[PDB]
């Protein structure tokens, strides 16, 4: 039945149980259950859940494949994984990654002073720390102190200039010096050219520092959908590696492939995100290198990958409850029975009646045209708003009955921000799998196009032919309906633009074991007041003025002004996310 | 001479003086001067400058045109401008906008609880406050208290549901009730009330005796509308909805909110305008279209309400960033490696090089490249070494360059100290291009096809050179002198969308005031320190220092004497911003 492609992007990490999606780990805890509990604890609004277990699965999944790949071709070189902090620096992830990847000697990558410091604090002693990006004397120095501190740090040079800087401060610091890495410029736009690489080696040689040159690195970019570019790159780099060793760089014993390992985001049959498998990527790496090592009869290099997206993507799920259900309301009774109807809508009537399986497709054509002519007349002021209404309703009825005789449904408003938790959606084509948390045992019957609570119309995940999304027809006020956005654990939080001040949603870390699951490490969403302060507003001032305006107001009495204060203070200390509007009173006699 | 199109996007707000760009206001203070001063005060790294004066110019520029447009056609209806906070909520702007737009009764627009509160605090009493977006009982209630507070607030309904909510809590609150606005769904734009829904909306208000509140209809076409036609098509349709609604009993309906859309000129290249219309044209069109409809339906000329935020906020801010280093191509013969026996492919490259001439120039160019492609293919196969590869690249480049010479790519890449994801997200997100020009040395002619890039690993963070975007910068010596670049019209949507990539936090910002005496720096906000940044991610600063302190102490690669020294440095770097210093 409808599984929302949970088998494509989901892998064996997520499974559907009693009509509800769960974490395929121990008792297969349902996400909808964890959500409910958190809501009971008073955590409403959108929430981001982190599942450390998934992080572990991913780590052992990377090491798992590369090891099996190494054994297959009997690769003598070693393998090591590094995590580029740039894809997600949030403690809720980083703290777990270093912890879970300890047994694997998983390292950390930094590309700024801020990240390097972080890395220097949480990276397990002994694990490698690579450093990319442009560096100044300060960054190089701190890299050095990281070495003196006992860390396995490697400074990757982006240009000869940086190399010189290191050489200089090298003879200025102490005995402990960091490892030097050279970023190669691939001809398959930063890095050292072939001629620059040679100079680089001579410089290190002149200053007796070849001992430091231990690895070359190249980056092709993130989410590489094709496997060919990687093979073309690895090959070129592999030869640069050997050539550099033959040049005297005896300590050069590793190649850093960088990132690029793609993640499967597709949730629709016949639309894979990447055309290759992890094992394929690993086998290809080990093979290409082995071959080159043999040809040049040199030493098989140590493999270093900095795949962050892959290891961080699935660890986080963004759950958001459906606030409202805006559908296409067009009942025949809505027709303002006019007395003297304009010819155009008159024809629309005749069509709605005479419509039959034979002239169905035809009528549909004509009906549309009529609506177009009426609208054009409306803008010319030749028809009243009732007419326009009639036209639109009839047109819809005709179009409806048309498809019926032939042989979007609703727009779900989700309590979250498509700019806050999912920037890659607005920034690029990046699409995240979306599926309800429960009611999966039932077949959805509503071509949906979910949109967030934002003025900007550019904030909605519209329905598509290639992206046919169907959600169950539920009653927001009668029951609860939560949506889940998966694989949102990479690059989304870091790129959380925070549009209409909608701050990061509440996040919680879910631990799972044989006993069950246990919520922990909750970070509640900021209050409006806190948010304003973060923009550098004077909270104290804002309250004084607010307090004053209510007091000096002459539209309400003291009694009321006090009441107002109570509310105002409640709203200030509350998060800015919207709440369901709920049931509305009936102001008409009924029974 | 080279003015970087300062006349296109610059308007009469920026002018070039003694070879340096300045604020065309009083003594025409040069930006490069203000920067220097701030650097002398110890504020290095990238800085965002805010010029309140520009904000004023813009406000009086909007009211100016709409007023002159109203007088031209003798429009009886009034005009009012509102500022959508969503385009920039930073105090450095907002506090100045409300202040400078007070005399104009400039209002504020909010689209969230957070923004509404803000608005309720800073919006001048009496000025209008419009509220768009989806609302829950809470947002509606606070809107109501804003009314009771004495504010001129209007709640714009997005759906019948919201209307009902208001109606309900209406008879629950007190006498003071907010004004009700209806967002119309335009059949020429997504959200809003359909024609049939609008009627129901009116009936509901009528049944609950609330027509008194329905005072304006609103529609939004979106931001940065480059074409004027869609606006005219919209205004027309809305204009008729307006009249029809009044004829339906909505007597209090006396205003139309056009929303945003007024485009800003970002183009700095001749023959490449961002918008095809002028502000006056936009104004004249609005006043005309409405007058006509009001006359045809012989109804009341509506009050004009616009919520153009980008227009009024764009130019107020300039992002200045110093050039840390220039990267070029070290291609010269002295780079060639005289090998005793080298591949015949590079042998041909030599001959080709010494045999080049006007006659065979264009031919040799082609052949030189093919040969390079060959040598490369061979390198990837392990048939040539790195030296050969180096010689090939050197020769090919030499030949290619010596070719263009005889025949009747980017010359240099500039490493600017800033983030193309932090201060300029609209660049990565969309096509959005911001004018770029040096702060000084303008009296000289630039001679370097440049492609400036920021200090970030991600290669997707660079403003590459283009045929349609031919950027030229002066050939300067980073270590010999200072060279600052300026990114203009960055005061809208950029800071709010400051992704903050590799943790590069918002740069230091300062508010520059200008008068007859000169300029005066004030309201400086220094850039966060690494430590502060880590805390903002919810890291335990105290913990991080303890562990860092401990690792140095228990280290066995350095002595006590040294460990103490390390500590001193470590603490200095922690309390410093994360931007690069110098190279
Ligand atoms: C050097 C380097 N390696 C790796 C990565 C991450 O690549 P990915 O997003 O595929 O994990 C980045 C970004 C980077 O700059
Ligand atoms: C309802 C509404 N009005 C106005 C604006 C502002 O548009 P702009 O930034 O082009 O001035 C926005 C955004 C909006 O959502």
TrEMBL record, chain B:
Its cofactor is pyridoxal 5'-phosphate; Mg(2+). The modification N6-(pyridoxal phosphate)lysine is found at residue 86. Pfam families: Arg_decarb_HB, Orn_Arg_deC_N. It comes from the Bacteria. The keyword Kinase does not apply. Its EC number is 4.1.1.19. InterPro entries: Ala_racemase/Decarboxylase_C, Arg_decarb_HB, Arg_decrbxlase, De-COase2_N, De-COase2_pyr-phos_BS, Orn/DAP/Arg_de-COase, PLP-binding_barrel. Keywords: Decarboxylase, Lyase, Magnesium, Metal-binding, Polyamine biosynthesis, Pyridoxal phosphate, Spermidine biosynthesis. Residues 61-314 form the Orn/DAP/Arg decarboxylase 2 N-terminal domain. The keyword Phosphoprotein does not apply. Pyridoxal 5'-phosphate binds at residues 86, 220, 223-224, 261, 309-310, 493. One of its GO terms (biological process) is spermidine biosynthetic process. GO terms for molecular function: arginine decarboxylase activity; metal ion binding. The active site is at 457 (proton donor). CDD domains: PLPDE_III_ADC. Gene3D superfamilies: 1.10.287.3440, 1.20.58.930, Alanine racemase, Lyase, Ornithine Decarboxylase, Chain A, domain 1. Residues 340-408 form the Arginine decarboxylase helical bundle domain. Catalyzes the biosynthesis of agmatine from arginine. Belongs to the Orn/Lys/Arg decarboxylase class-II family. SpeA subfamily. PANTHER family: ARGININE DECARBOXYLASE, BIOSYNTHETIC ARGININE DECARBOXYLASE. This is Arginine decarboxylase. It comes from Campylobacter jejuni subsp. jejuni serotype O:2 (strain ATCC 700819 / NCTC 11168). The lineage of its organism: Bacteria, Pseudomonadati, Campylobacterota, Epsilonproteobacteria, Campylobacterales. The gene is speA.
């Amino acid at each position: 039945m409808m599984d929302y492609g949970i088998d494509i992007w989901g892998n064996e990490n997520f499974i559907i149980k009693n009509g509800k999606v769960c974490i395929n780990y121990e008792k297969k805890p349902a996400i909808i259950d964890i959500v409910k509990e958190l809501r009971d604890d008073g955590y409403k609004g959108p929430l981001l859940l982190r599942f450390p277990h998934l992080i572990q699965k991913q780590i052992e999944n990377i090491y798992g494949n590369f090891n099996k790949a190494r054994k297959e071709f009997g690769y003598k070189g070693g393998f090591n994984a590094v995590y580029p902090l740039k894809v997600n620096q949030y403690p809720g992830f980083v703290k777990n990654l270093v912890k879970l990847g300890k047994d694997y000697n998983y390292g950390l990558e930094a590309g700024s002073k801020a990240e390097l410091l972080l890395a220097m604090a949480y990276n397990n002693e002994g694990a490698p720390i690579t450093v990319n990006g442009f560096k100044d004397r300060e960054l190089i120095n701190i890299g050095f102190i990281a070495a003196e501190m006992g860390h396995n740090i490697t400074l990757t040079i982006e240009g000869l200039n940086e190399l010189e800087a290191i050489i200089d401060i090298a003879k200025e610091r102490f005995k402990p010096k960091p490892n030097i890495g050279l970023r190669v410029r691939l001809h398959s736009k930063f890095g050292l050219t072939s001629t620059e690489l040679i100079e680089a080696v001579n410089l290190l040689k002149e200053n007796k520092l070849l001992e430091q040159f231990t690895m070359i690195h190249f980056h092709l970019g993130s989410q590489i959908t094709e496997i060919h570019p990687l093979k073309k790159a690895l090959n070129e780099a592999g030869n640069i590696y050997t050539e550099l060793r033959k040049m005297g760089a005896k300590n050069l014993k590793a190649i850093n492939l960088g990132g690029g390992l793609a993640v499967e985001y597709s949730q629709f049959k016949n639309e894979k995100s990447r055309n290759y498998t992890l094992r394929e990527y690993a086998n290809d790496v080990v093979f290409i290198l082995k071959n080159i090592a043999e040809q040049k009869k040199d030493l098989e290099p140590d493999i270093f990958i900095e795949s962050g997206r892959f290891v961080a993507a699935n660890h986080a799920v963004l759950i958001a409850p459906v606030l409202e259900l805006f559908s296409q309301e067009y009942a025949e009774n809505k027709l303002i029975l006019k007395k003297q109807n304009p010819k155009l809508i008159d024809e629309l009537y005749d069509l709605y009646k005479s419509i039959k399986p034979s002239n169905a497709l035809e009528y549909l054509h004509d009906s549309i045209d009529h609506l177009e002519s009426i609208l054009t007349l409306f803008d010319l002021g030749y028809v009243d708003l009732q007419d326009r209404s009639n036209a639109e309703i009839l047109t819809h009825l005709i179009t409806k009955k048309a498809i019926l005789l032939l042989g979007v449904q609703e727009r779900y408003l989700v309590n979250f921000s498509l700019f806050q938790s999912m920037p890659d959606f607005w920034g690029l084509e990046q699409n995240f799998p979306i599926m309800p948390l429960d009611r999966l045992d039932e077949e959805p019957t509503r071509s949906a196009s979910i949109w967030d609570i934002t003025c900007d119309s550019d904030g909605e995940i519209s329905y598509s032919k290639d992206k046919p999304l169907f959600l169950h027809d539920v009653d927001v006020e009668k029951e609860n309906y939560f949506l889940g956005f998966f694989l949102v654990g990479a690059y989304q939080e870091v790129l959380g633009m925070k549009h209409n001040l909608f701050t990061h949603p509440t996040e919680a870390i879910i631990s799972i074991n044989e006993k069950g699951y246990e919520v922990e490490g909750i970070i509640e969403a900021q209050s409006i007041l806190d948010t304003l302060e973060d923009l550098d507003y004077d909270i104290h001032a804002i309250m004084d003025i607010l307090n004053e305006r209510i007091s000096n107001s002459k539209l309400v009495n003291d009694k009321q002004k006090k009441h107002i204060l109570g509310e105002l203070y409640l709203f200030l200390n509350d998060n800015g996310y919207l709440k369901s509007i709920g049931v509305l009173e009936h102001h008409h006699h009924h029974h």
